[PDB]
Amino acid sequence: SVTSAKVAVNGVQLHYQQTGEGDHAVLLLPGMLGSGETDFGPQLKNLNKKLFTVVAWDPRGYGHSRPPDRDFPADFFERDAKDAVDLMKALKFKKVSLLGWSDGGITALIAAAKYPSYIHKMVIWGANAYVTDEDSMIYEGIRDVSKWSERTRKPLEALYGYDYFARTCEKWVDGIRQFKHLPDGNICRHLLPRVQCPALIVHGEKDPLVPRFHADFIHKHVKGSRLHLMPEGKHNLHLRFADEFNKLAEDFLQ
Numbered sequence: 001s002v003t004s005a006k007v008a009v010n011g012v013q014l015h016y017q018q019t020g021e022g023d024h025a026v027l028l029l030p031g032m033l034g035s036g037e038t039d040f041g042p043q044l045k046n047l048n049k050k051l052f053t054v055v056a057w058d059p060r061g062y063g064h065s066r067p068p069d070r071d072f073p074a075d076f077f078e079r080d081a082k083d084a085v086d087l088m089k090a091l092k093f094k095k096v097s098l099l100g101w102s103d104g105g106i107t108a109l110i111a112a113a114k115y116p117s118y119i120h121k122m123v124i125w126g127a128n129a130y131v132t133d134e135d136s137m138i139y140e141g142i143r144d145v146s147k148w149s150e151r152t153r154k155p156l157e158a159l160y161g162y163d164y165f166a167r168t169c170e171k172w173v174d175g176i177r178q179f180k181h182l183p184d185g186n187i188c189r190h191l192l193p194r195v196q197c198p199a200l201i202v203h204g205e206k207d208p209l210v211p212r213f214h215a216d217f218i219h220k221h222v223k224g225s226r227l228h229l230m231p232e233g234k235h236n237l238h239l240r241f242a243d244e245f246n247k248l249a250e251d252f253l254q
């Protein structure tokens with residue numbers, strides 16, 4: 001049983017879904033243009049409701065956290081990280097664990113580094129701490145939503161309508177490509193050494209969007225972290241292999 005609602009955080013009404021009665025609070029952070037509705041159905045349904053209280057949030061401009069419309073300033077990952085932690089604090093949780101996918105994993109890393117006393121444990125997958133030329137070209141190949149597969153475009157087009165979906169995707173490409181021009185193409189390389197909580201980095205070996213070297217790099221600089229490789233996993237491993245992923249996450253969180 002899942003409840004959807006909005007809470008006022010930093011000047012915006014953020015939408016979120018919540019389920020479970022457990023004493024261990026867990027926030028699910030979605031990826032690019034994501035939402036709890038499109039990115040975490042399996043987790044909101046199957047994560048142990050006796051052990052955890054699960055919340056899936058929609059970053060400002062994404063999902064149902066509209067208005068406002070989405071924009072990508074240089075500090076957009078940091079802004080999301082603040083909103084994410086403030087949202088859980090607004091919901092009265094004293095400490096939480098983070099499950100971040102893609103852009104949400106980048107967001108989670110930043111949150112753990114900036115608010116260490118608030119984060120218990122973290123599980124992230126499909127994230128990258130910096131942008132290379134290879135990454136930049138991958139992003140550019142995502143700009144045109146009309147070239148997306150029908151299966152991948154359908155859910156987002158239905159959630160946002162073609163116009164907003166297409167425009168926001170282009171803004172995302174420009175937004176994440178901007179980091180390439182900064183020293184080291186940096187997004188959060190400098191924050192990895194500041195993560196103090198136990199972290200599990202999962203990577204789908206067949207992920208076509210994020211090369212494994214990005215997972216190796218995060219594992220290398222997040223002290224005490226563990227890296228788990230899934231031979232058949234792709235970018236959406238928590239959806240395609242939900243049962244396998246949920247077990248990995250639940251075992252690590254306990």
Ligand SMILES: [Mg+2]
Pocket residue numbers: 183184
């Ligand atoms: Mg360098």
Ligand SMILES: [Mn+2]
Pocket residue numbers: 004015016017035036037058063064065
């Ligand atoms: Mn929503």
